[PDB]
Amino acid sequence: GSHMSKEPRDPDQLYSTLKSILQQVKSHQSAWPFMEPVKRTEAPGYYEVIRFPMDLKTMSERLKNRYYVSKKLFMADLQRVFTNCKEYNPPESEYYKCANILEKFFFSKIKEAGLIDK
Numbered sequence: 454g455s456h457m458s459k460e461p462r463d464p465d466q467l468y469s470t471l472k473s474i475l476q477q478v479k480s481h482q483s484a485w486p487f488m489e490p491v492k493r494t495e496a497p498g499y500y501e502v503i504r505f506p507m508d509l510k511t512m513s514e515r516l517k518n519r520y521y522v523s524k525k526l527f528m529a530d531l532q533r534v535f536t537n538c539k540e541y542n543p544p545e546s547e548y549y550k551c552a553n554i555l556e557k558f559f560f561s562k563i564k565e566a567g568l569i570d571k
């Protein structure tokens with residue numbers, strides 16, 4: 454019929470698809486606040502604000518073997534990464550910058566892969 458691009462294709466393609474998005478999002482210069490692991494009190498205001506701390510170092514870990522195969526599961530965590538930084542980081546900081554730049558890249562990429570869910 455026509456072209457709308459707004460629906461994943463089976464868990465097989467979607468699986469590696471999330472693995473590709475992470476490969477780019479993580480490889481993106483604006484991913485160091487999530488790619489590498491963070492300390493425990495190195496973040497200005499952590500634990501007592503982030504209900505579910507998350508980072509890219511954990512996604513690729515499970516996504517590698519078999520975990521983020523769904524569209525909402527991956528989007529939830531990944532989206533939790535961009536907001537988590539934006540959460541404990543003030544309005545003026547490099548953490549938010551790279552998090553807002555990569556987050557923009559993420560939404561666009563998924564917007565084209567008919568992903569996104571919650």
Ligand SMILES: CC(=O)/C=C/c1cn(C)c2ccccc12
Binds near residue numbers: 492497503508535
């Ligand atoms: C994106 C996220 O959920 C958590 C990021 C950080 C957690 N900690 C403890 C940090 C310390 C420094 C910088 C970033 C973080």
